Design a protein around this ligand. Structure first.
Ligand SMILES: [Zn+2]
Lengths: 50, 122, 203, 118, 86, 105
RNA sequence: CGCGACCUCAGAUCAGACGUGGCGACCCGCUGAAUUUAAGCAUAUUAGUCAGCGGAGGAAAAGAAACUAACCAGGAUUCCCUCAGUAACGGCGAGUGAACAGGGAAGAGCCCAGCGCCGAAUCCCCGCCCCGCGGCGGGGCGCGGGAAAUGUGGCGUACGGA
């Protein structure tokens, strides 16, 4: 929808920013257990709700 | 320099604003230097200025408040900021003195018949 | 004094003097709203027995309660079950109408607290009660050592727990062999105590 | 006195203003949207420069709560210039991009060197 | 045609985001939330779903004001005092 | 289904009794709590006796127990009047007083 | 009609304060089933139970007899043992089912209306003084305002009281 409200566009802004992968150096840490981002949302598979 | 809180309290209120906006000014090109690709040494300095701005603005917020509550120290009515905020249930209770109020009938009882200290034998 | 002569004056409700007055107040109270404030007691003698004192902080509200029993709020019969619970017309509410008047007065004026209530008139469809309310934050009530028990947070909404004089009648509590099923805290406490297994360590 | 109209209206009773014996809050809240917080950082995008030498404008990242009037006075106060017009948009990333058109007596290239972007 | 061909006409959202509970359960036509009951002053909760209770209780969120009441409780809620300076 | 020989039993377990089950694991901890509060009370009234005020000599009702003698709620006003002790002063010196008791004997 | 009390009833972004909502393991007041059993099932039983509603507190409620008893009598409320699976209720079927007394834990009593006596002897707010002021507290001054005679305060509550 080209027509948007300020609530939806602000809400869509966070989900776009959360779709980026983890940094390269994050598994150089000491007690880190994260291998990759398990919350990567693809626009074809996961439809985000709404 | 390492801005401390001890020496900031004795300075003038308008002198703090003279220092505050310069810290605000000096932080402005630091965000510019991040976008333009500045040196990594200057990118580690911006957290110090953020905490130094927080230090300056705290003292301005601090020193204003004890001037206000000293001004309202003797008055009957004070703003709700200066009133003690502690757990609304007990702000609705009585004062220190009011449950110490005994009736004239009750005060006669302990004077006429006080509780006695006594002991018994075997 | 004069308070005694009004005590048995209200005990003669069938007399000509009271029957004229009771039908005038009932007409007057009917044209008003279902909830409004009375500025002074119509029954000054009754309020003193219940604990009202004519000072600042003592507030009384006069309301009405619709007369009759309680029918079951169900769609057209809506009793999907055994014939025992098929009764819908001749059911009765567990609490009295006076206790309902204490609940409605306390729910509206939530800042005040209900002391007691009394009867001032009735109709075919309405019962009229004056309900005494106490302001727990007025300095006359707050600084008086006799009346500061209202100010404690334990006595919030006494009429909601049935702790008032009218609400205590429907609880069925009291001393004697007629109140065996309310021994303990309440009716619920008696059933709870009698329906538990005291499984000891050594049995 | 006589009643000309058959309807009864409530008489206009006098009402006072607020005369508090104490303010509700001790001190007024300080302005958190100052001239420094409103302008975050300018853009060094190849489209951002392309907006500069051609249109004689400036591109900034500004807070989402800002007005076009507030951006006009902010750029005026911070850099000692004046602004012809301001066009704003909200990028899907989440903060607000504003195009600041400068007056023809000022040059977008020269003011860029004082503020460091090139 | 009650199956696959009937899902193609789904383009009108009936629910939307609530601004008190955060869940997408605010019915536009009834102007009410099916999760928390937005127009009602009281939060919608029921005892027949204990799992739905513990999804949103006093322990789930930030407790940005309640976590300092517990810290201040163990000192008796002292006010106006400061530790002895150097 | 009953067996050959046995009793007819009425187990009162047809309600949801498993919810209302009162275990007694607090009993060893309760006894310590009763003792510690009792010892703390005694130190508060250190010259006064730990039991409290004295109790009168009381015959039992319910003829099954009518030959037994217990310790009662409090001394009657007739018993205090003969002893020459004012009823409002006896309570301060550790005498249990109640106005409900009678004196038939 | 002018002028002035009083009673009812309004308007306030009036001065000063109060309630809303959350949690809800425990508690109080309502409302309140059907699965199940009775080898069916309808009274019963499940069960004042689940669910629903309101209200608090750190505990709540109850509580100092219009009591229990018929004894040579006990003597506020609450909890444990026992009474007792008893008296009793129940298509007297399934099943349901207390209370007194006794031994313990604890143990604290009291206040009004009315009856009357005291010159309203009473209380709230606003201003001033003094002293602490994060619980504005007390005392003193108010031909300062108000509440209160449609009854405040002291003595005084069944054990008697003046
Ligand atoms: Zn919602």
């Amino acid at each position: 929808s080209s027509h948007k409200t300020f609530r939806i566009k602000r809400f869509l802004a966070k989900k776009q920013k959360q779709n980026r992968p983890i940094p390269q150096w994050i598994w150089m840490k000491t007690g880190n257990k994260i291998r990759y981002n398990s919350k990567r949302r693809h626009w074809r598979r996961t439809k985000l709700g709404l | 320099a390492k801005i401390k809180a001890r020496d900031l309290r004795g300075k003038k209120k308008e002198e703090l604003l003279k220092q505050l906006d310069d810290l605000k000014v000096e932080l402005s090109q630091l965000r510019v230097a991040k976008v333009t690709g500045g040196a990594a040494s200057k990118l580690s300095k911006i957290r110090v200025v953020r905490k130094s701005i927080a230090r300056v603005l705290t003292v301005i917020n601090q020193t204003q408040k004890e001037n206000l509550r000293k001004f309202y120290k003797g008055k009957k009515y004070k703003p709700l900021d200066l009133r003690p905020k502690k757990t609304r249930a007990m702000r609705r209770r009585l004062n220190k003195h009011e449950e110490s109020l005994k009736t004239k009938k009750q005060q006669r009882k302990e004077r006429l018949y006080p509780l006695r200290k006594y002991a018994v034998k075997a | 004094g004069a308070y005694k002569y009004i005590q048995e004056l209200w005990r003669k409700k069938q007399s000509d003097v009271m029957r004229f007055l009771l039908r005038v107040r009932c007409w007057q109270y009917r044209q008003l709203s279902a909830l409004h404030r009375a500025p002074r007691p119509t029954r000054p003698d009754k309020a003193r027995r219940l604990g009202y004192k004519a000072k600042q902080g003592y507030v009384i509200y006069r309301i009405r309660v619709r007369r009759g029993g309680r029918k079951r709020p169900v769609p057209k019969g809506a009793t999907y079950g055994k014939p025992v619970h098929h009764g819908v017309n001749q059911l009765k509410f567990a609490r009295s109408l006076q206790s309902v008047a204490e609940e409605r007065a306390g729910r509206h004026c939530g800042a005040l607290r209900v002391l007691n209530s009394y009867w001032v008139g009735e109709d075919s469809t309405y019962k009229f009660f004056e309900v005494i309310l106490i302001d727990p934050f007025h300095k006359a009530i707050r600084r008086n050592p006799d009346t500061q028990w209202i100010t404690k947070p334990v006595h919030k909404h006494r009429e909601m727990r049935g702790l008032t004089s009218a609400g205590r009648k429907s609880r069925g509590l009291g001393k004697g062999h007629k109140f065996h099923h309310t021994i303990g805290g309440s009716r619920r406490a008696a059933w709870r105590r009698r329906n538990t297994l005291q499984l000891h360590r050594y049995r | 006195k006589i009643r000309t109209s058959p309807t009864f209206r409530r008489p206009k009773t006098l009402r006072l203003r607020r005369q508090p014996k104490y303010p509700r809050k001790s001190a007024p809240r300080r302005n958190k949207l100052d001239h420094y917080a409103i302008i975050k950082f300018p853009l060094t995008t190849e489209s951002a420069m392309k907006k500069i030498e051609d249109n004689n404008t400036l591109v900034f990242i500004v807070d989402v709560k800002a007005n076009k009037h507030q951006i006009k006075q902010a750029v005026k106060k911070l850099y000692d210039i004046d602004v012809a017009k301001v066009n704003t948009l909200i990028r899907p990333d989440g903060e607000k991009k504003a195009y600041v058109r400068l007056a023809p007596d000022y040059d977008a290239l020269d003011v860029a060197n004082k503020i460091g972007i090139i | 045609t009650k199956g696959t061909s009937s899902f193609g006409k789904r383009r009108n959202k009936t629910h939307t985001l609530c601004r008190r509970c955060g869940s997408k359960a605010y019915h536009l036509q009834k102007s009410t939330c099916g999760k928390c009951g937005y127009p009602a002053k009281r939060k919608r909760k029921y005892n027949w779903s204990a799992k739905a209770k513990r999804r949103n209780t006093t322990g789930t969120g930030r407790m940005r004001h309640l976590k300092i009441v517990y810290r201040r409780f163990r000192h008796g809620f002292r006010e106006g005092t400061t530790p002895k300076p150097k | 289904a009953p067996s050959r020989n046995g009793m007819i039993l009425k187990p009162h377990f047809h309600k949801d009794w498993q919810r209302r089950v009162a275990t007694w694991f607090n009993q060893p901890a309760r006894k310590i709590r009763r003792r510690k509060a009792r010892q703390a009370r005694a130190r508060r009234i250190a010259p006064r006796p730990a039991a409290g005020p004295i109790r009168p000599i009381v015959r039992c009702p319910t003829v099954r127990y009518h030959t037994k003698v217990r310790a009662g709620r409090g001394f009657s006003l007739e018993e205090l009047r003969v002893a020459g002790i004012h009823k409002k002063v006896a309570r301060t010196i550790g005498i249990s007083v109640d106005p409900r008791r009678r004196n038939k004997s």
